[PDB]
Design a binder for this molecule. Structure first.
Ligand code: 2NC
Ligand code: CL
Ligand code: CL
Ligand code: CL
Ligand code: NA
Lengths: 99, 99
């Protein structure tokens, strides 16, 4: 699709068998999802932005479907106020900024 | 241009006659820049990010160039970790997200 930016660019994702809403965030290096179970091993990470830092769990090789487009990559899980799809998965669905 | 997301989407901006670097950020409602002097009166605003909330100074109808495109609009100034160009100005330069 072509997504205009008059409103927040929210899409449906499927992760871990669950449907969620998430924000497409070109300003995020990483993908960060609210608390949920994911398979495999994890390691802790601290990630920051406006307001400071939160602690998350890093899971690798997670398959996600983003507005219908499958991608695989690292997903961070923790107390984020908003589910965010960051660049590590936006690249995989071929997302670009155009002007 | 067409900007891919393998690296951070950093562009040069011009504000107050000065060149700065900023992040094109579809996940930001607003444009937030690090401490600098801007003309006129400001109004208070609270904004949120991944770590919580911060207070910023809201300046309206500020002239700002983004990657060579002229915009005039609201700029927030405060303790953001990075300069961010949000949707308020991304819409003025005609930016879309495409996949
Ligand atoms: O981790 C890397 C190194 C990097 N961190 C830093 C410190 O650079 C990073 O990628 N951080 C990510 C991040 O927070 N990126 C932000 C830009 C760069 C840091 C400032 C942009 N993220 C968005 C979405 C965050 C959602 C939790 C963001 O902060 N949006 C704000 C911007 C402020 C503004 N007023 O526009 C935002 O839109 N805030 C509005 C509220 C939105 C509330 N939405 C809901 N649903 N409640 C607002 N009006 O205040 C993070 C994500 C780590 C990878
Ligand atoms: Cl990844
Ligand atoms: Cl590409
Ligand atoms: Cl504006
Ligand atoms: Na894994």
């Amino acid at each position: 699709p072509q997504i205009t930016l008059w409103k927040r660019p929210l899409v449906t994702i499927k992760i871990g068998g669950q449907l969620k809403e998430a924000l497409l965030d070109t300003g995020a290096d990483d993908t960060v999802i609210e608390e949920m179970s994911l398979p495999g091993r994890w390691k802790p990470k601290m990630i920051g932005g406006i307001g400071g830092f939160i602690k998350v769990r890093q899971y690798d090789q997670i398959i996600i479907e983003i507005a219908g487009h499958k991608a695989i990559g690292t997903v961070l899980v923790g107390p984020t106020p908003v589910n965010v799809i960051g660049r590590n998965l936006l690249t995989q669905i071929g997302a670009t900024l155009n002007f």
